Design brief:
This is part of a larger assembly, with chains A (about 50 residues) and B (about 160 residues). By secondary structure, chain A is an all-alpha fold. Chain A has two helices and no strands. Chain B contains three helices and eleven strands; from the N terminus they run βαββββαβαβββββ. Classes of the chains: A mainly alpha (about 50), B mainly beta (about 160). Chain B binds three DNA and RNA strands through helix 1, helix 2 and strand 6. It is classed as transcription.
Chain lengths: ~50, ~160
Amino acid sequence: PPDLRPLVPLDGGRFATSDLNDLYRRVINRNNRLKRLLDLAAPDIIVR
Amino acid sequence: MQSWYLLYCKRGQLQRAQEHLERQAVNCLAPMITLEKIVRGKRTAVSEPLFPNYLFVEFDPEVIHTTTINATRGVSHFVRFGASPAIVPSAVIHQLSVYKPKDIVDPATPYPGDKVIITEGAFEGFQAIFTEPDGEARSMLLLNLINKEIKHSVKNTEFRKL
RNA sequence: UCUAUAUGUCAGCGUGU
DNA sequence: CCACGCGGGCGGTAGCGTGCTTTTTTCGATCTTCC
DNA sequence: GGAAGATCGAAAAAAGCACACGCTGACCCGCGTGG
C-alpha cells in the first residue's frame, strides 16, 4: 500500500522518494519492456 | 574468425556508440525504422530502432579484445549469459536482416482520430478525440463541453494518451 | 487526541554507561 | 534556457578492492574398501 | 580391478557485531532530448 511507502514532501519543492518506490518502478519498467519485446516477436537471444 | 555478439547500450547513446564502433572498424547491425513519432507533442517523421538499446557487433576477439569493446564510449555492457559473453548464431543475423515489421511504439500511442486526455489549462482532466497537428507545435482535439464537443487547437504538451 | 507546529537516512562526533 | 522522462555501475575506449569471528555448505583430491 | 561411498581438509558464502540520548552537515537521480 502507498501509505506504508509514503512520498513525503521535501519542503523545498522536491519529493523524497523511498527505495521501495524505485524498486517497484524498475520492476514495472522491466515488465513493460519485456511485454513489448514479446509482442514484437523478438528472437531468442533478446527475449532471453 | 569473426563472430557476432549482442551489446546493451546506454539510454539514448546508441548513435554515439555506433559512430565510435565504426571508428574502430567493427561491423555492427541494429534494426532501424523511420516512422511518425509524437516527440513531446509535435508529430514528426524520425527514425528509431526496433529492440532499443541493442546492437549486434561482428568482430574477431583476436584482432580486438572484448574488454576494448566493453570500454567503448556509449556502450553499456556485453549481453552475457554465464561467465562468457553470448554468441549470436548467423541464422539469427540472417533472420534479422530479413526481419521487417511495421508497428507502433508507446511514445507514438496517439495516432489520427483517437482518445486523448487533456490534463492542463482550463480544460484539465477531460477526454477528447485527437486527429492532427496543425503545423508542428499546434494539435487540435474534439474538446468536450457540457453540451457537445467542438474541434479546437491546444498546446501539444498539455495532453497525454489515456 | 489529526489542533498548531504533523520526513527520512549517511557521515562526523559527544554524553551516560 | 525551462521542461522531461526513462535505465541506472560509473565511466570508459579499464579498473575499482585490500586490518573479524563463527557457522554452514560444498568441492577436489584422495583413499580405501569392496564384489 | 574399477566404481562407490566417504572423508577430509580447504575454499566460499552467510550472519552478527548492547542500550539510551543530544548536536552538526549533506542530500532525497543526472543527462541526452525537446521545444
